[PDB]
Every structure is written in C-alpha cells, then in structure tokens.
C-alpha cells in the first residue's frame, strides 16, 4: 500500500524462459489482492508460454505487482516462485516490458535463475474519455472488451414490477413532448408467449408451472388466466419449439436451502412438462452455484402497420423469474390481496411455517425487468443457444438460416435519427463450462475481455459494464439491488483477514472512489442505494446474518472513504448527503372486509409479531442501476461476488441508453428519466420538483428526510394510517469515523430477533455467502 491504482492495467504474461501432470499457470496480484490468472499449460514443463493478455480493473492500494508461478498438478500442486514489479514502475502510465527474476520465499532467485516476461501499462481513470463525462455523445461506442458489442437501432421497455394498475403514474413530461407511460411486464410476456409461432426459449433460476401471468380483474386479457405451464404445453403441442433451461435445484446447497435462500421449484416444473412437447432441461451449474439468468426469447410479428408476414426476435431480461411470489404491483400489499391475486400465490419465506391459512403479511416483491427489441434481442437468443449447446437436450434449436424468409436477419426497429431509439449492449457472468462457442486462442479471448479461470474461460462483462457505468458518472447513481457487498480487498482487518473473504469485485469501491473524486473537485454528486431490509430467508439464520455482516463491512469501507475525503476538504458534513442507503417497507391498517385466516401463528414468533404489528419489508429483488438519468443496467446480477465473479452464478444483464436523450448539454429527459421518476413516485409516494435533479443537496436532503419519516411510521409501536410511502432509511447509523452503528432501540429488525448489523459465521465459508 503506497500508490492508489484506480484505472485499468493492461497486462500480458508471455512466458517463463526456462524452469530448471504438470499444469503451469501464473497469477497477478496487486499487493495481496488477486486480480488475474493465466490458463494452465500442459506439455511445456520447462518453457510455459501463455501469451495471455488482461485488461485489469484497478481500485487498489499497492506497492508491488506480484506474479506467482504455480503448478496445479493433481498429484500435488506446488509454488514455483514470485516475481515483483514495483508500482513505481507503472504509476506514470508508461509502458513497462520486462524480464523479471522469479524468487523463492526468501526473495532469492529460484534454482537456475528463471525469469518471467511481462508487459504492463497503467491507465488512470481520468485517461478515459468518458471519465466524469457520462455517455457524452450519440457516437459512444459501447463498453470495450466484451463478448457482445453494443447494438444500434434497438428499443427497450422498462418494467417496474410484474404489473402496474391503471393510471398509476403521475404526469412525468419527457423531452419528446409526451408523458412517461409505464409498460406492464407480465401482460407483455403473456402476449409474447401466446403469439409466438416458431420458438419460445426460457431460462430461470426457478419456474413454477402453476402461476397465471395475468390476474388484474380490471385489465382482463383473453386466456390470461391460463397457467404458464398450460400455456407452454399448448404452444408446444401446436408445433412451437418450446425449450427451457431451468436451474437444477436438485443440486442446491443444503445449508442455504434450510436457511431459506433457495426457495425454487425447478424440479417440480420438469416433472410437469415431461411427456409434453415442452423440452424442459434441468441445468446444473457445473453446484456450489446456480444458474441465475432469467430469460424469455420469442419470435414476434415484425412492426408493420399493413403487415409483413415476417417475424423478428424479442427478448426479456431482468430480475423477475416466472415463478411463485413474483407477481405484484407498486401497491405491494401485505394483507389486502390475500383473497385476490395472492390467494393461490402466497409467498413468505421469512417465517417458519408461513401459510395463507395462518395469515399475512405476505412478502411483497419489488423487482425490475426489461423487454429488448432490435439486434440486441438476438444476442440474448445467442446466449440461450450457447447454453443449450453445452448443457441442453437434443439438437433442436431453431436454425435461423433455414428461416431467412420467415424470421428476419437481426435488424433495427427504429432509425438511428429517431429520438426514441436505444443503443443497447448485452453483458453476462458465465464461463465455458456452461456456454459453448467461446474463442480458444488468447488473442481472441482478450479482445472480448474473457479471462482465464481455474479450468474454464470466463465472461465477466457484467462487472465490467458496472465499473464503466460508475466511472463515467457525473451527476448521480441510483441503485436497487438484492445484495450490496464486495470489494473485500479494501475492507478493514476488523476481526477478519480480508484476503480470506475473496469478494474481490469492484462495485462498492468504485462507487466510493467516484464519490471521493467528486468531493475533491467540489462537484455535486449523490449515490442512492436501495437494498432489502434483509435478504430473503429466516433473518436469524447463519446465512442471512453472514450476509448482513458482509453488507455492514462494505458500507463501513465506503463511509470511511467518504468521511476521509470530506475531512481533507475541511468539510464537516453528514456523509449521508453523499452516500445514502434505504430499504423498502409497508404497513397497513386493518380495514373492514379483509381476508380472515382460519388459523394463527404461534404466540411468540416473528410471524405473530409481524402479523399483529401489520408491517413487513417490501422485498427488493431488483438488480438495476441508473446513472445520470441517461444510462441503465437491468439484469439478474446482484452486487455480490456470486453474481459479479463470472465463474460463480450465471447471470445476464443489458445496459442501454437513448443516444438522443443524454445528460450532456440538456438534462436527460427520456425513458430512463421517466422510469427513475416513476420508481421514486412508487417508493416516496409523491413527486417533487427537487427530484428532477438528484445531484442536488436539496434532493438528497428531502429524500433522506422523507425516508426517516417513513422509518418512524414503520417502526412505531402505534399505527393510525397506512404507510404513505415505502422508502425507509436503512436502519443503521454512521459514526463520526465511519463505523456502522445500531440505531437506539433497534439491535434487531422490528418484530424479529435478528441483528441488523449481522453476525459473522464460524461455520459457513465466505464462498457460500459472498
Ligand atoms: Ca415495486
């Protein structure tokens, strides 16, 4: 630790000249923090040649860049030695190309004097032309070094929950002269599946065949009450190619399942479809990990007022699986839908023995999804094809070249001059064990940002897209995510050895370094983060407690960064006017005519307490980030190592902007702005002029104040009225030095015996919980 490397480190590890079943590889560390490794080379025991290149994202304190040569021989693994390049050598940004001595544990040359050949070049974040500039022109080329390139001529529909009722949204005027109009996710998916004529491809972490997609009696749709299972079986019986890849939840980790973290129905679904014309494949990770992508791909009629007989591809990505517990609206009711839309869809995994017959609260489900049109839709389909080819069933993917006269070649849905147009790019966390067709040669892999893992090539373009989206930010960042933990290389060694945690992804540290850079420049900037009150499961459980502890350490790292920057500027200010954390909750007075359960919970349980207090969190399952009202990422990937790693859970996400609605010379007032405002209206219960510019001090102060008011209403012993909104200040305090503290009287979440600050586990290894 001397030298902050915040930027990108281009590296090539060529070879070891001469070492005087062997599987030789080299790792790259920034001080103690691992940042890359080569593939393993066989049949070259004396002169291993990797010729492997890296584009390493740096946000690290370091004195030495350390290359370790190792042999992963199954009969025994061995350390060959270490080579050191001082950070002084790269800090000025000039290219370094060196043959450096490999040394033993006493820093003496290893036998024979072997040297490793490496090339390095450090690019500080401000060397990037979008650093602190946003997207900054309609000619922005996309995120570099990714497998999928940015697509033009696209259209994205943004979905706020599974469903939205009639006339929900206030008037949110947009640059083109109309008001923002919310789209409805499961109505649209129902239509997409019902109208497909050639293919329906679905992936899910969980699929439940017995749910209906359409349930709003005020917005009925013909056939909308059919279950998704009966709908898919009908379409397949008519000849549509219906292919599902559902995570093999038979491989779950028992301890996580028992704690409530894996409430899935994939196996049940496979039994539902076998014998039908639906091809439902149970897909193991290849477990400790899961297949977490949530995908729907269909053929759809080509936009054409008169009609073209032709078809195009349309794809959905985001957080919402087609399973139990996901249907909801921004009302997020705890008790008042138990005899309507949740009577047969009661989801509450946070109490032992929760059941509709014992009453609510159910767990409301806040989530975000998207529909993708234009060439990007084929990229999602290509992901499905890669996975099916590797882990699917028979050779029954639709062959798009045999259908050139039926399904168009990948094509835009709008002209690039149309201000509604989107530029969209697809990102993933997946590896060669799960997806066929990645390039084998190191040069081609590096051009796509693919990195070597222990045994497979790795796509980590989701983490890369997040890093890039944060670095170009200039006004504000708004995050909703199921998890918020990581950058453990920069955690305090406070009762832990940080290097043992291995939650190395950069998102939390990039956020705090971005905040620090703006403070240093005296430029206004705000970061808003909405997380669930606790991650789904029994909150007293080892798993949930471990996650809250990781979350606490992550928050503490960031606030210490912020406070240190404020103090260096001579500022004494509340760091929560720079970085602010929220969760969501609801609370409903018992009005006449509500569902009356036949039974009750046991007398001194979380369940009984929550039922009597009439309150519960609204679960934040979203995985979305909005930057500057101009760029948005929506997908399946949580802000944790499980999602960001690349070789842990498989994930997918899109990142997009409208090139004519950027935040450059005018405020961004396109679809992303409309959506962000619609989300804020849902959570705050109101819109206010100050919310138009979330970088302002007046905005964050007002949002924070409202969220404190709602926490007071939520957590009070007394209840007179429904909660007027849902956004709660996350129930922690920030000490003057950045330590996260309990609130007075709230060691535990309301109605629970669960510590808000969490508990480090002595049994669960961090690989399971990070
Ligand atoms: Ca919602």
Curated annotation (Swiss-Prot):
Tissue-specificity statement: Highly expressed in roots, stems and flowers, moderately in leaves, seedlings and siliques. Not detected in seeds.
How does it sit in the bilayer? Peripheral membrane protein
Residue numbers binding a 1,2-diacyl-sn-glycero-3-phosphate:
292, 482, 621
Record key words, sorted: Abscisic acid signaling pathway, Calcium, Cell membrane, Cytoplasm, Cytoplasmic vesicle, Endoplasmic reticulum, Ethylene signaling pathway, Hydrolase, Lipid degradation, Lipid metabolism, Membrane, Metal-binding, Microsome, Mitochondrion, Repeat, Vacuole
The protein here is known as: Phospholipase D alpha 1
- What family is this protein classified in? Belongs to the phospholipase D family. C2-PLD subfamily.
Q: How does activity depend on pH?
A: Optimum pH is 4.5 to 5.0 in the presence of micromolar levels of Ca(2+) and PIP2. Optimum pH is 5.5 to 6.5 in the presence of millimolar levels of Ca(2+).
- Which SUPFAM superfamilies does the entry mention? C2 domain (Calcium/lipid-binding domain, CaLB), Phospholipase D/nuclease
Knockout consequences: No visible phenotype under normal growth conditions, but improved resistance of the seeds to deterioration during storage. Insensitivity to abscisic acid for both promotion of stomatal closure and inhibition of stomatal opening. Hypersensitivity to hyperosmotic stress. Increased NaCl-induced disorganization of microtubules. No effect on abscisic acid-induced stomatal closure. Pldalpha1 and plddelta double mutants have a suppressed abscisic acid-induced stomatal closure.
Its UniProt domain note says: C2 domain is a calcium-binding fold, and the binding induces conformational changes, promoting the protein association with membranes. These conformational changes occure at millimolar Ca(2+) concentrations. Also binds PIP2. A lower affinity toward calcium can be anticipated for PLD alpha due to the absence of two potential calcium ligands.
Encoding gene per record: PLDALPHA1
- Which top EC class is named for this enzyme in its record? hydrolase
Primary location recorded for the protein, binned into one broad class = cytoplasm
Q: Where is the PLD phosphodiesterase domain?
A: 287-326, 616-643
- What is expression of this protein induced or repressed by? Up-regulated by abscisic acid and ethylene. Up-regulated by salt, dehydration and osmotic stresses. Not regulated by abscisic acid.
Please give the activity regulation comment for this entry: Not inhibited by neomycin.
Q: Which organism is it from?
A: Arabidopsis thaliana (Mouse-ear cress)
| Compartments reported by the entry | Cytoplasm; Cell membrane; Mitochondrion membrane; Microsome membrane
Recall the GO molecular function terms of this protein's record: calcium ion binding; GTPase activator activity; phosphatidylinositol-4,5-bisphosphate binding; phospholipase activity; phospholipase D activity
Functional description taken from the UniProt entry: Hydrolyzes glycerol-phospholipids at the terminal phosphodiesteric bond to generate phosphatidic acids (PA). Plays an important role in various cellular processes, including phytohormone action and response to stress, characterized by acidification of the cell. Involved in wound induction of jasmonic acid. May be involved in membrane lipid remodeling. Probably involved in freezing tolerance by modulating the cold-responsive genes and accumulation of osmolytes.
UniProt domain C2: residue ranges: 1-100
Per its UniProt record, the required cofactor names are: Ca(2+)
Q: How does it assemble?
A: Interacts with GPA1. This binding inhibits PLDALPHA1 activity and is relieved by GTP.
A biological process from GO: ethylene-activated signaling pathway
Reactions it catalyzes: a 1,2-diacyl-sn-glycero-3-phosphocholine + H2O = a 1,2-diacyl-sn-glycero-3-phosphate + choline + H(+)
Q: PANTHER family, alphabetically?
A: PHOSPHOLIPASE D (PTHR18896), PHOSPHOLIPASE D ALPHA 1 (PTHR18896:SF115)
């Amino acid at each position: 630790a001397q030298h902050l490397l915040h930027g990108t480190l281009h590296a090539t590890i060529y070879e070891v000249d001469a070492l005087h079943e062997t599987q030789l590889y080299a790792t790259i560390d920034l001080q103690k923090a691992r940042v890359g490794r080569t593939r393993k080379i066989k049949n070259e025991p004396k002169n291993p040649k990797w010729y492997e290149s890296f584009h390493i994202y740096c946000a690290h304190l370091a004195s030495d860049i350390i290359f370790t040569v190792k042999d992963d021989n199954p009969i025994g693994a061995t350390l060959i030695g270490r080579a050191y390049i001082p950070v002084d050598q790269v800090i000025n940004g000039e290219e370094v190309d060196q043959w450096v001595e490999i040394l033993d544990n006493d820093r003496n040359p290893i036998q024979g004097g072997s040297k490793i050949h490496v090339k390095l070049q450090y690019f500080h974040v401000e060397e990037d032309r979008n650093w602190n500039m946003g997207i900054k022109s309609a000619k922005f080329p996309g995120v570099p070094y990714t497998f999928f390139s940015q697509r033009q001529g696209c259209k994205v529909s943004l979905y706020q929950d599974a469903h939205i009722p009639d006339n929900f949204v206030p008037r949110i005027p947009l640059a083109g002269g109309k008001n923002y109009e919310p789209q409805r996710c499961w109505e649209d998916i129902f239509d997409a599946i019902s109208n497909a004529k050639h293919l329906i491809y679905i992936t899910g972490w969980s699929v439940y065949a017995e749910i209906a997609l359409v349930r709003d009696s005020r917005r009925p749709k013909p056939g909308g009450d059919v279950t998704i299972g009966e709908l898919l079986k009908k379409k397949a019986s008519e000849g549509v190619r219906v292919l599902l890849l559902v995570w093999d939840d038979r491989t779950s980790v028992d301890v996580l399942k028992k704690d409530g973290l894996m409430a899935t129905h994939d196996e049940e679904t496979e039994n539902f479809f076998r014998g039908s014309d639906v091809h439902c494949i149970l897909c193991p990770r290849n477990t400790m990990f899961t297949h977490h992508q949530k995908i729907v791909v269909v053929d759809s009629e080509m936009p054409s007022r008169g009609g073209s007989e032709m078809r195009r591809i349309v794809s959905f990505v985001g957080g919402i699986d087609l399973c139990d517990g996901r249907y909801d609206t921004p009302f997020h009711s705890l008790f008042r839908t138990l005899d309507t839309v949740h009577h047969d869809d009661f989801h509450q995994p946070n109490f032992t023995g929760a059941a509709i017959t014992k009453g609510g609260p159910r767990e409301p489900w806040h989530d975000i999804h998207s529909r993708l049109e234009g060439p990007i839709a084929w990229d999602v389909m290509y992901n499905f094809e890669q996975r099916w080819s590797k882990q699917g069933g028979k050779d029954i993917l639709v062959k798009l070249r045999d259908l050139s006269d039926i399904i168009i070649t990948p094509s835009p849905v709008m002209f690039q001059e149309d201000h509604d147009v989107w530029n969209v790019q697809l990102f993933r966390s997946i590896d060669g064990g799960a997806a066929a067709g990645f390039p084998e040669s190191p040069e081609a892999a590096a051009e796509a940002g693919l990195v070597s893992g222990k045994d497979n090539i790795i796509d980590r373009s989701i983490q890369d897209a997040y890093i890039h989206a944060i670095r170009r930010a200039k006004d504000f960042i708004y995050v909703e995510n199921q998890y918020f933990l990581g950058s453990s290389f920069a955690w305090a060694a406070d009762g832990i050895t940080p290097e043992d945690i291995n939650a190395l992804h950069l998102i939390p540290k990039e956020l705090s370094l971005k905040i620090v850079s703006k403070i240093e420049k005296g430029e206004k900037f705000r970061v808003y983060v909405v997380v669930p009150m606790w991650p789904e499961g029994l909150p007293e459980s080892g798993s949930v407690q471990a996650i809250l502890d990781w979350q606490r350490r992550t928050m503490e790292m960031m606030y210490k960064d912020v406070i240190q920057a404020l103090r260096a500027q001579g500022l004494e200010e509340d760091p929560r006017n720079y970085l602010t954390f929220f969760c969501l909750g609801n609370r409903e007075v018992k009005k006449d005519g509500e569902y009356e359960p036949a039974e009750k919970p046991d007398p001194d349980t979380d369940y009984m307490r929550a039922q009597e207090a009439r309150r519960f969190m609204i679960y934040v399952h979203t995985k979305m980030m909005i930057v500057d009202d101009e760029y948005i990422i929506i997908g399946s990937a949580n802000i944790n190592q499980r999602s960001m790693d690349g070789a842990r859970d498989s994930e997918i996400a899109m990142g997009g902007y409208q090139p004519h609605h950027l935040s450059h010379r005018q405020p961004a007032r396109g679809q992303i702005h409309g959506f962000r405002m619609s989300l804020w209206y849902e959570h705050l219960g109101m819109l206010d002029e100050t919310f138009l510019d979330p970088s302002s001090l007046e905005c964050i102060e007002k949002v924070n104040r409202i969220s404190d008011k709602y926490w007071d209403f939520y957590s009070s012993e007394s209840l007179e009225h429904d909660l007027p909104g849902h956004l709660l200040r996350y129930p922690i305090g920030v000490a003057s030095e950045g330590d996260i503290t309990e609130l007075p009287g709230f060691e535990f979440f309301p109605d629970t015996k669960a510590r808000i600050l969490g508990t480090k586990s002595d049994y669960l290894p961090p690989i399971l919980t990070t």
